[PDB]
Amino acid sequence: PGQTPIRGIFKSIAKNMDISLEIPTATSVRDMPARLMFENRAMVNDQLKRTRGGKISFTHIIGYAMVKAVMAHPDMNNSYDVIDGKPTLIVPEHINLGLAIDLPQKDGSRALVVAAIKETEKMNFSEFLAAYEDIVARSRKGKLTMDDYQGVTVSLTNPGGIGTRHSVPRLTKGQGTIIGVGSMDYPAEFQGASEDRLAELGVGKLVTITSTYDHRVIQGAVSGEFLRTMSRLLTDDSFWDEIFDAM
Amino acid sequence: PGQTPIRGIFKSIAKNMDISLEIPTATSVRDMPARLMFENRAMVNDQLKRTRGGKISFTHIIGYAMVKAVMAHPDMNNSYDVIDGKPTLIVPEHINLGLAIDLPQKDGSRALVVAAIKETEKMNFSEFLAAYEDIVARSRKGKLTMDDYQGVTVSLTNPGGIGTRHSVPRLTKGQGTIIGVGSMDYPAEFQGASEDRLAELGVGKLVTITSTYDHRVIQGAVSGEFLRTMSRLLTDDSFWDEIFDAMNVPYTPMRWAQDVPNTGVDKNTRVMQLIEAYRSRGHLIADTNPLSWVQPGMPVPDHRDLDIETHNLTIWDLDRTFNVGGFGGKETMTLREVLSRLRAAYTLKVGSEYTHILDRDERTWLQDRLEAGMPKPTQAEQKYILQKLNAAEAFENFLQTKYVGQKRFSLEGAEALIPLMD
């Protein structure tokens, strides 16, 4: 009980959230079928098991889809700044994808920092998976440099791990959009039904995806088209041929 | 038409909303099953009706759950301030819960102010309900002081009353989070379907809950874990045991489970076995003891035969219809009505044992009279019972007064013997 000054990494988090009050933001929400993901992911993990490899996750697949979508709609990668006292649009060279890694510290308090996978627009699924696992691996061993925390152009967050249906997050300065992935579960009106009965009807599972963007440089139509493309890829013949070929 | 200055309470509302522009906020949304709430709330309100009490609401239950969740995740109670020009985290002493009360004024314009229930983390459900109703009662009579509007640490709002599905509200300065409760209704793609068809599938009702928090002091993971805890409590065995204990209801609460298929032994067979169990062993849970007393050294018989789980039935069967073979003078009935009648006949103030009798005509005679019930007595009859009770107690007290030490072997505690013999 009482009052206590904020110090350390927590002070940095507080300062940046205050800075972010100067970005006008809007959000879009879309729900997508997730049956084909479950099926095809299982097929890939069976191949890896016989060849004594590892295991891929849903975040890997949605991550790769997001990259392909940003290439199709490049405006989602731009940002805003005032330079020499004039408004300015910033068009980067690469797509650097920031992952929100929740890592506990020595003290025993959870604190998140966003690390980057760099130069993603010249990768196939095999290369992408390697880079992803590289960042994660070095984070646990505590071997991340200061260069890994710089140059992020677009971010990805996963509140669905705990079981949240969707969220409306904050956007940090220096980026144009942040994408959020929600729970992959039956709706709550079906959570007491029998397997037999659901199978008869033909009920599938969902995933809800959100897009929060800076409205000075990105318009609503673009954000909508982005989410429509992501929806099409996760149920597309040609998309899964790529992944299967590479693995 | 035209322009007009803002004055009064409205000016205060405008100023505070402008101040709130300096709080960075984020929101989380989660949907939760609500079937077990409907069931167990009904069970509690039945007990209150017989004891001539009141009636509990959904806001009471969700309110209490929210309190328990804040205790499990204390970070949700903190706030931010700049003191001596340094950033600071504020950790309060108590959990004070603000209620959004919409009250019309003398003029005829609606205006809301948030009142507080204080020191909530040291309350059980009975205490909580009393405090809640206290605030509401005094608000209508116009007897709230200035102290009641101060010291709020966390707030609760209910846009679902009108029928909104969910909202994204504003957070006011001096708090860390605000929680919102949405509509408890079927989704809109089912609002034209038949009851029969929904019952077959096993479709339930929802409730959507939101959390809007200050991002300088609360992180997203904490907000998510908070909502996950609330979801678990509203479908948890131990949670409902607390509520039932505090309100003095004698039955085991309905439990949460999945719907099972109608395979193997048919469900009509199972309902007939439940009827036989109550007729045979229902006396083991009847309300026949005036004291709330269990003797410590005595064995307690098994009475697992009287709950619907042992006969492979579930909450999802309560509104379906079954063949009951003349029970209640009907060929067909719902499981809800079956339970109701069984409990009225074999679990109130009279417990009976008669199923061991070998003759069929005897058994049927007793069975018919016990299930018809006790007929309502006239006013003359009622007054006659009161005279006899009075005579008993009065006689004992007189002798106590006039002859103190003398041995008489009193009947005090058992005065109902006199009207029984009569």
Side-chain angles (χ1 to χ4, degrees), chain A residues 1-105 107-247, chain B residues 1-105 107-262 264-375 377-422:
Chain A
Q3 310 181 351
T4 183
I6 301 165
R7 296 201 294 284
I9 191 170
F10 296 113
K11 198 188 185 186
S12 294
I13 288 166
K15 186 188 166 63
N16 283 295
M17 288 290 105
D18 267 346
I19 283 170
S20 66
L21 274 171
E22 70 196 54
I23 306 169
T25 50
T27 308
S28 302
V29 185
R30 190 171 181 132
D31 53 341
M32 299 177 195
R35 179 83 177 198
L36 209 71
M37 275 182 95
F38 275 77
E39 294 306 312
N40 288 351
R41 176 179 163 259
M43 278 190 92
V44 170
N45 284 354
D46 289 353
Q47 182 70 13
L48 288 182
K49 181 158 61 174
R50 68 176 66 186
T51 310
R52 278 196 315 295
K55 200 187 208 304
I56 76 173
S57 71
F58 288 118
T59 305
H60 293 132
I61 297 162
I62 295 171
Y64 188 67
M66 168 176 173
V67 166
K68 300 274 92 181
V70 171
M71 290 192 229
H73 299 280
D75 292 353
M76 296 293 298
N77 205 21
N78 299 342
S79 70
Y80 175 101
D81 200 351
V82 68
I83 286 174
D84 166 63
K86 300 170 61 179
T88 307
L89 181 65
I90 293 180
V91 179
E93 295 178 1
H94 303 294
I95 299 173
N96 303 353
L97 186 76
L99 295 177
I101 304 183
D102 185 12
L103 64 97
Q105 310 193 111
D107 287 355
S109 46
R110 66 211 301 169
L112 191 144
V113 290
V114 183
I117 299 171
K118 305 213 184 183
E119 296 179 306
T120 300
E121 76 287 0
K122 53 179 66 165
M123 281 184 189
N124 70 344
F125 183 71
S126 290
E127 291 171 9
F128 183 77
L129 188 72
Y132 191 112
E133 291 284 60
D134 177 61
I135 293 285
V136 170
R138 286 194 287 124
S139 76
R140 297 187 187 291
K141 296 185 296 187
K143 301 191 72 66
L144 279 168
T145 55
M146 177 166 300
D147 182 56
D148 294 314
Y149 297 116
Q150 290 189 346
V152 176
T153 74
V154 63
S155 291
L156 182 70
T157 182
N158 186 20
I162 296 168
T164 307
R165 182 61 67 185
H166 76 88
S167 74
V168 179
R170 305 287 298 171
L171 190 65
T172 189
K173 182 173 179 179
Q175 290 158 54
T177 187
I178 178 166
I179 300 297
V181 181
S183 170
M184 291 178 91
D185 207 310
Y186 288 119
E189 61 263 38
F190 287 122
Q191 271 172 348
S194 70
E195 295 300 303
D196 294 350
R197 193 66 57 187
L198 286 182
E200 181 170 301
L201 196 299
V203 172
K205 297 203 190 172
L206 290 163
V207 63
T208 311
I209 292 174
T210 59
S211 170
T212 305
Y213 55 97
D214 183 0
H215 210 313
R216 296 177 290 192
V217 293
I218 299 166
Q219 292 179 311
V222 177
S223 182
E225 286 174 2
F226 173 79
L227 286 179
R228 184 170 66 182
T229 294
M230 272 193 87
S231 190
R232 276 169 188 174
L233 282 176
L234 284 165
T235 186
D236 188 20
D237 293 0
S238 306
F239 176 74
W240 284 105
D241 295 359
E242 271 185 56
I243 295 179
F244 271 32
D245 186 14
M247 297 292 296
Chain B
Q3 309 183 349
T4 183
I6 301 165
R7 296 201 295 284
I9 191 170
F10 296 113
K11 198 188 183 186
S12 294
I13 288 166
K15 186 184 167 63
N16 283 295
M17 288 290 105
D18 268 346
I19 283 170
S20 66
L21 274 170
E22 70 197 55
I23 306 169
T25 50
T27 308
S28 302
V29 185
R30 190 171 182 131
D31 53 341
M32 299 178 195
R35 180 83 177 199
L36 209 71
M37 274 183 95
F38 275 77
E39 294 307 312
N40 288 351
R41 176 179 163 259
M43 278 189 93
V44 170
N45 284 354
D46 289 353
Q47 181 71 13
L48 288 182
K49 181 161 61 175
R50 68 176 66 186
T51 310
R52 278 192 314 296
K55 200 183 207 304
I56 76 172
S57 71
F58 288 118
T59 305
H60 293 132
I61 297 162
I62 295 170
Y64 188 67
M66 168 176 174
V67 166
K68 300 274 92 181
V70 171
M71 290 192 229
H73 299 280
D75 292 354
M76 296 293 298
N77 205 21
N78 299 342
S79 70
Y80 175 101
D81 200 351
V82 68
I83 287 173
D84 166 64
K86 300 170 61 178
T88 306
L89 181 65
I90 293 180
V91 180
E93 295 178 2
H94 303 294
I95 299 173
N96 303 353
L97 186 76
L99 295 178
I101 304 183
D102 186 12
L103 64 97
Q105 310 193 110
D107 183 288
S109 299
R110 66 211 302 169
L112 190 144
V113 290
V114 184
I117 299 171
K118 305 213 184 183
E119 296 179 306
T120 300
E121 76 287 0
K122 53 179 66 164
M123 281 184 189
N124 70 344
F125 184 71
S126 290
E127 291 171 9
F128 183 77
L129 188 72
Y132 191 112
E133 291 284 60
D134 178 61
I135 293 285
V136 170
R138 286 194 287 123
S139 76
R140 297 187 187 291
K141 296 185 296 187
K143 301 188 72 66
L144 279 168
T145 55
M146 177 167 299
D147 182 55
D148 294 313
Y149 296 116
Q150 290 189 347
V152 176
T153 74
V154 63
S155 291
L156 182 70
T157 182
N158 186 20
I162 296 168
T164 307
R165 182 61 67 184
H166 76 88
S167 73
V168 178
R170 305 287 299 170
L171 190 65
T172 189
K173 181 171 176 176
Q175 290 158 54
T177 187
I178 178 166
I179 300 297
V181 181
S183 170
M184 291 178 91
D185 207 310
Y186 287 119
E189 61 264 38
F190 288 122
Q191 271 172 348
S194 70
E195 295 300 303
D196 294 350
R197 193 66 57 187
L198 285 182
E200 181 170 301
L201 196 299
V203 172
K205 297 204 191 173
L206 290 163
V207 63
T208 311
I209 291 174
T210 59
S211 170
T212 305
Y213 55 97
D214 183 0
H215 210 313
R216 296 177 290 192
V217 293
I218 299 165
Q219 293 180 311
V222 177
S223 182
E225 286 174 2
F226 174 80
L227 286 179
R228 184 169 66 182
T229 294
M230 272 193 87
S231 190
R232 276 169 188 174
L233 282 176
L234 285 165
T235 186
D236 188 20
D237 293 1
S238 306
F239 176 74
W240 284 105
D241 295 359
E242 271 186 57
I243 295 179
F244 271 32
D245 186 14
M247 296 293 296
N248 300 306
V249 316
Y251 304 119
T252 297
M254 294 283 188
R255 296 278 185 272
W256 170 263
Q258 267 206 345
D259 190 52
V260 301
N262 187 42
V265 174
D266 177 45
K267 280 183 174 177
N268 283 285
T269 303
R270 298 174 211 175
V271 169
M272 295 285 290
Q273 285 175 348
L274 179 80
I275 288 171
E276 187 168 3
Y278 267 81
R279 277 169 173 173
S280 180
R281 285 173 162 65
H283 57 86
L284 291 176
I285 64 168
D287 182 12
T288 51
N289 199 312
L291 307 176
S292 61
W293 174 246
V294 289
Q295 179 63 17
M298 290 268 286
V300 189
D302 162 47
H303 61 62
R304 278 177 295 166
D305 287 289
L306 292 172
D307 52 300
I308 70 177
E309 285 64 64
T310 194
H311 302 285
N312 293 72
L313 290 169
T314 301
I315 55 170
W316 300 110
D317 294 286
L318 280 166
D319 284 2
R320 294 174 179 157
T321 292
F322 295 102
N323 293 255
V324 289
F327 179 68
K330 293 190 178 184
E331 292 299 305
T332 296
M333 230 180 237
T334 60
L335 182 62
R336 191 186 293 288
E337 189 179 355
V338 166
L339 261 174
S340 175
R341 284 177 177 252
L342 284 177
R343 277 174 176 166
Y346 294 118
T347 304
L348 270 48
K349 301 282 176 188
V350 178
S352 65
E353 305 191 69
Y354 72 96
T355 292
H356 59 284
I357 293 168
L358 287 184
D359 180 64
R360 187 186 292 288
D361 294 9
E362 264 185 58
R363 271 205 308 281
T364 296
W365 188 98
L366 279 162
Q367 172 175 291
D368 289 352
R369 275 169 194 283
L370 288 174
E371 281 170 355
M374 170 181 88
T378 64
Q379 290 199 0
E381 287 180 290
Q382 281 175 337
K383 205 202 182 193
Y384 184 64
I385 295 170
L386 181 67
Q387 274 177 43
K388 301 263 71 171
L389 280 176
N390 182 59
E393 188 183 352
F395 182 78
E396 292 296 311
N397 283 348
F398 198 76
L399 283 171
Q400 172 73 344
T401 301
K402 296 296 188 186
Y403 312 108
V404 179
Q406 297 209 50
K407 189 185 283 83
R408 58 196 172 81
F409 289 118
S410 53
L411 187 65
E412 284 169 350
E415 289 91 341
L417 186 70
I418 301 303
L420 177 59
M421 284 185 79
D422 197 287

